[PDB]
């Protein structure tokens, strides 16, 4: 019964504290969320100061519960429905050929606001890698994230790989894997397999002058 939580336009914070290979840093996300219309809108910033890693490589971390269901597929939305307690969001992601990201997040009201906590840990990154390198494009393709039950756990597994640009036109890898959790005791909806159509547009703030990224994201669900 989380619905008539997302029935209009939801403030949304994000918090991250990481470490890549040594490499600390921390980012804040500010933004607005429009279940309706699987509409996200946030702006990043990286408090510590210069990003250690990619921007894009950050993207999957940084809120599944604006996804747009379709009327005839509500029964499935997991996400909106361990709300108001929320949930745990973990995932092991691994770059290919390189290190991989290791995740633990909450997702969860504080109030009025939708607030995503998380602790990222990555390692057996090649500084002289793609990542480590800095050598992905500034943008984003759109992916389709499947969506399976783990009646087991309570929860959900979820599968997927994203493909990031390289600078030559050639692409990085990303294989995800997670998994997700209610934080109640409460009932949640299990789903039946289907999967969320992920688009995402990246871009700047000229006005800014931190480290950032601007991101504009709709999320629809499908399959079903």
């Not at 990003?51 to 909106?80: E, I």
């Not at 606001?113 to 998380?118: G, M």
């Not at 990222?120 to 759109?142: Q, R």
Request: aromatic fraction near 10%.
């Amino acid at each position: 019964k989380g619905e008539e939580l997302f029935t209009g336009v939801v403030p949304i914070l994000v918090e991250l504290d990481g470490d890549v290979n040594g490499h600390k840093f921390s980012v804040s996300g500010e933004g607005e969320g429009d279940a309706t219309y699987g509409k996200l809108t946030l702006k990043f910033i990286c408090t510590t100061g210069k990003l250690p890693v990619p921007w894009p490589t950050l993207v999957t971390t940084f809120v599944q519960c604006f996804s747009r269901y379709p009327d005839h597929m509500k029964r499935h939305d997991f996400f909106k429905s361990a709300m108001p307690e929320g949930y745990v969001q973990e995932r092991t992601i691994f770059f290919k050929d390189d290190g991989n990201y290791k995740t633990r997040a909450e997702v969860k009201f504080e109030g009025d606001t939708l607030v995503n906590r998380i602790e990222l840990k990555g390692i057996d990154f090649k500084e002289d890698g793609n990542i480590l390198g800095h050598k992905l494009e500034y943008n984003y393709n759109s992916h389709n994230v499947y969506i399976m039950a783990d009646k087991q756990k309570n929860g959900i597994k979820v599968n997927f790989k994203i493909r990031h640009n390289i600078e030559d036109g050639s692409v990085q890898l990303a294989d995800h894997y997670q998994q997700n959790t209610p934080i109640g005791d409460g009932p949640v909806l299990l789903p039946d397999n289907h999967y969320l159509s992920t688009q995402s547009a990246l871009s700047k703030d000229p006005n800014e002058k931190r480290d950032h990224m601007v991101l504009l994201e709709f999320v629809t669900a499908a399959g079903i």
